[PDB]
Amino acid sequence: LTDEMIAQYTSALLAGTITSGWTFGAGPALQIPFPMQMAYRFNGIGVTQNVLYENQKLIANQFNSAIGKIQDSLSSTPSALGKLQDVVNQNAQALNTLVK
Amino acid sequence: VTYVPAQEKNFTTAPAICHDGKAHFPREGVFVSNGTHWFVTQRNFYEPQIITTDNTFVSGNCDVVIGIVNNTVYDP
Numbered sequence: 001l002t003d004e005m006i007a008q009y010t011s012a013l014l015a016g017t018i019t020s021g022w023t024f025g026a027g028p029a030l031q032i033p034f035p036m037q038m039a040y041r042f043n044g045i046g047v048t049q050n051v052l053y054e055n056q057k058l059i060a061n062q063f064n065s066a067i068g069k070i071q072d073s074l075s076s077t078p079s080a081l082g083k084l085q086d087v088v089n090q091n092a093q094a095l096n097t098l099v100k
Numbered sequence: 101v102t103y104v105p106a107q108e109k110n111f112t113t114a115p116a117i118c119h120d121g122k123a124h125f126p127r128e129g130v131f132v133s134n135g136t137h138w139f140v141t142q143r144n145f146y147e148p149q150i151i152t153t154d155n156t157f158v159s160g161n162c163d164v165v166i167g168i169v170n171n172t173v174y175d176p
């Protein structure tokens with residue numbers, strides 16, 4: 001599989017979860033507005049749904065700000081992808097030792 | 101052994117109902133309509149019912165929600 005195929009798979013999953021919810025994981029997909037999905041997910045932890053319907057803008061703003069801060073946090077700190085780099089370095093070191 | 105649903109249909113929905121200046125929310129149902137009447141049903145099976153005071157709870161006045169419709173509620 002090339003890179004664009006995996007990207008397409010990720011896009012498909014994102015679209016499915018945005019437009020349907022958990023319904024498409026078991027059987028046919030069904031459509032529903034996003035705020036209603038958020039209210040249903042609120043009901044799964046122990047909070048009544050009206051709390052969502054009177055604070056929409058605050059939650060939306062917090063969500064957007066969090067996404068932006070995640071972008072900046074990823075950009076700034078340099079050593080955040082250590083595991084994959086370690087794997088690559090280990091393979092290269094083993095091959096170099098074998099060749100020597 | 102599993103359970104798989106099928107044979108879906110289209111409907112229209114609203115978040116809440118404003119009656120007498122108060123906001124009415126469902127208990128464990130969803131508000132649906134087919135035309136000039138409104139009902140409440142469960143998510144995983146179609147079963148309409150008439151809206152009474154034993155399947156809704158009241159909170160505030162119908163002025164803060166984005167999207168609310170006028171309709172009557174039966175009083176037993």
Ligand SMILES: *[C@@H]1O[C@H](CO)[C@@H](O[C@@H]2O[C@H](CO)[C@@H](O)[C@H](O)[C@H]2NC(C)=O)[C@H](O)[C@H]1NC(C)=O
Binds near residue numbers: 134135136137139148
């Ligand atoms: C679905 O819509 C139909 C009409 O499009 C409704 O049918 C009538 O509704 C009135 C009042 O609600 C009843 O008195 C009649 O008995 C209904 N049937 C007929 C043949 O007139 C119907 O109520 C709506 N809702 C449902 C659940 O079917």
Ligand SMILES: *[C@@H]1O[C@H](CO)[C@@H](O)[C@H](O)[C@H]1NC(C)=O
Binds near residue numbers: 108109110
């Ligand atoms: C529901 O409406 C959509 C368009 O809004 C239409 O494409 C579809 O055929 C309708 N029926 C079902 C079962 O989705």
Ligand SMILES: *[C@@H]1O[C@H](CO)[C@@H](O)[C@H](O)[C@H]1NC(C)=O
Binds near residue numbers: 166
């Ligand atoms: C739904 O979307 C339509 C299309 O813009 C809009 O006119 C209407 O106000 C919306 N209803 C809501 C957000 O309750």
Ligand SMILES: *[C@@H]1O[C@H](CO)[C@@H](O)[C@H](O)[C@H]1NC(C)=O
Binds near residue numbers: 170
């Ligand atoms: C509901 O009714 C009131 C008056 O009873 C009216 O002022 C208001 O615009 C109506 N709203 C809707 C969504 O029908």
